[PDB]
Amino acid sequence: MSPIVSVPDITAPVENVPAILPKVVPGELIVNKPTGGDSDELFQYLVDILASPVYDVAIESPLELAEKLSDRLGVNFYIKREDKQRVFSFKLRGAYNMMSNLSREELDKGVITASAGNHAQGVALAGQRLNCVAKIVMPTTTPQIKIDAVRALGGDVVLYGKTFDEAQTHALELSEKDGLKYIPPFDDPGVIKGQGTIGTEINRQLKDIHAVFIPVGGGGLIAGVATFFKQIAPNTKIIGVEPYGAASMTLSLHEGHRVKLSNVDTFADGVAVALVGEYTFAKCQELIDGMVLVANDGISAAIKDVYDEGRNILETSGAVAIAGAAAYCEFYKIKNENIVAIASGANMDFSKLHKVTELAGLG
Length: 363
Description:
Layout: E1 13-14, E2 30-31, H1 39-51, E3 63-65, H2 67-73, E4 76-81, H3 92-100, H4 104-109, E5 111-114, H5 118-129, E6 134-138, H6 144-152, E7 156-159, H7 164-178, E8 181-182, H8 189-205, E9 209-215, H9 220-232, E10 237-243, H10 248-255, E11 260-261, H11 278-287, E12 290-294, H12 296-310, H13 316-331, E13 338-343, H14 353-360
Helix pairs in contact: 1-8, 1-9, 3-5, 3-8, 8-9, 9-11, 12-13, 12-14
Organism: Solanum lycopersicum
Protein name: Processed threonine dehydratase 2
Function: Involved in defense against lepidopteran, but not coleopteran herbivore insects. Acts in the insect gut to degrade threonine, which is an essential and limiting nutrient for the growth of lepidopteran larvae. Active against both L-threonine and L-serine.
């Protein structure tokens, strides 16, 4: 696309109501017919992804064979463990890549974003490595322990607003006012290329993949991974996964244009996105095979699945793609194929397991 700099959003509003969802069961593929994208643009992405300095902050995370899930489903079920990054999610990658491309002058001024979660941690970490002040704007109502999490990384946290939107608005206007570069959570080529490095790793770690399942909030992660994969392993399906109650990418792809959901279920907070990105929606139209929807009980059961493997806890958004991959395997009776799901993060309040156990128990 082109960069959207100053105009307010005018994306067509859609009332988020059960009657609008495609009538599919969990794991049933909502088909996308990819348009292909541009050869030169994709090539530029490939090279930028390969040149990305993410390893200044990130590791090549494990691609782990999930034994129990594999035995149950009769496939080779692999989980890409981005929850094993320093900040417990993949988001250090995009943030560092984009920030590392800023001029030394821009970095000396300092950067700004609004977040009290996974993106905030990635940005703060990148700020520390790049020796620059990152101002993270959070609502005044933010649990002290998350403020400390970001301050621990060296973030200059600022309290403002009662919701993420007011904090965000304030961070954005404070951006134009103070002349600070805004670091976007997903809607940016630099960020997309950072997340794309996960495609490189997965492909390096495993060939002959039937499908890679990827959680979709804003669409940065999937756009990045799909960009690498559709050039390097074109026969592999790239499938996005979303909660029924937050199906903004699915609805957008179905309508043929971005769509703004009136409200979203927040159980999977990281993917509770009302409006997908401009760059990322275009990449999905161009590249991905389709979308799969999951419910909160399926998400919760996936958290239990991973616990049952090694007693690690994923956050709800981090388990979304696992739920999607598993459901897809059962729906299509996939057998003896390689399946990858991305475990995208593990920053969840301990107390949320109260609700998760309740939903996981439904079987």
